[PDB]
Design a protein around this ligand. Structure first.
Ligand SMILES: O[C@H]1CCCC[C@@H]1O
Ligand SMILES: O[C@H]1CCCC[C@@H]1O
Ligand SMILES: [Cl-]
Ligand SMILES: [K+]
Ligand SMILES: [K+]
Ligand SMILES: [K+]
Ligand SMILES: [K+]
Ligand code: NI
Ligand code: NI
Ligand code: NI
Lengths: 154, 147
């Protein structure tokens, strides 16, 4: 067992547009996505999975995709066993053609190690009738792993 | 040596097409990338810009950006950049794409899954940030970039 380490709080980057609309909802889809982000910090897969279509998809890119609502829940749940969302901060959101884009920092705690880390993520969401048909997050896995002693690949 | 379109790519035939003047530019900026000319690419940038491949430190200012590009270009070159999804809002443009990248010391290639954001002011880039996993690139082409 290891104590919860300090949770370093979130830098507001120099490149963060200070047009305060850039990080604000503008479509019903965008509104949904932002709401979904807020749900992450609940670390509850049953809460999250309701946002998804049956015919959906989910992938942290340095990690294998989950195809199908059933696969996605397993992946989500799997993740929630070694890590936990403390905070999700979306600097920029935007949409087009059914896709929504979020520039974020996620604040995560590796459960086994108790270590915390702030992750630069750019995610894309696909919606269809208010339901997530795809969710893909882009980030660098090695530096999260190293930061919190949690080898996640393989 | 091609790029297969992944089963999750929007079949919306507009999704990957440039939709606004800012998105036309970004799409052009990336054909320009296969030139692998830092001197040319910097044309698209404003003086008050920044550039970061997020696994690597940011480059602030146009001269930094150019140099960091030039440096990158010493060890690698693009061969292709296919863009599946493109969209925008509030002067930011997002691209989901695949960069085929070749390592100059080893000759080995790797297709990189990328999601990038661009900030434009009056048709000039004032921010370009690519999100991707660095490790699987290195491991693929045997070219370390973050010791
Ligand atoms: O932001 C990412 C980082 C860690 C894996 C899941 C999360 O969605
Ligand atoms: O697309 C990325 C992948 C390799 C590092 C630089 C490039 O911009
Ligand atoms: Cl799909
Ligand atoms: K700047
Ligand atoms: K917005
Ligand atoms: K839009
Ligand atoms: K488009
Ligand atoms: Ni231990
Ligand atoms: Ni301890
Ligand atoms: Ni501590």
């Amino acid at each position: 067992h290891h104590h919860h380490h300090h949770t370093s709080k979130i830098e507001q980057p120099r490149w963060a547009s200070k047009d305060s609309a850039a990080g604000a909802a503008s479509t019903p889809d965008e509104k949904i996505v932002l709401e979904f982000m807020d749900a992450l910090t609940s670390n509850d897969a049953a809460k999250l999975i309701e946002y998804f279509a049956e015919d959906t998809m989910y992938q942290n890119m340095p990690l294998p995709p989950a195809y199908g609502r059933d696969a996605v829940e397993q992946t989500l749940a799997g993740l929630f066993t070694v890590m936990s969302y403390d905070a999700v901060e979306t600097f920029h959101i935007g949409s087009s053609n059914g896709l929504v884009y979020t520039e974020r920092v996620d604040v995560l705690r590796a459960l086994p190690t108790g270590k915390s880390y702030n992750v630069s993520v750019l995610g894309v969401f696909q919606l269809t009738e208010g339901k997530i048909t795809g969710w893909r997050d882009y980030f660098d896995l090695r530096e999260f792993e190293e930061a919190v002693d949690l080898p996640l690949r393989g």
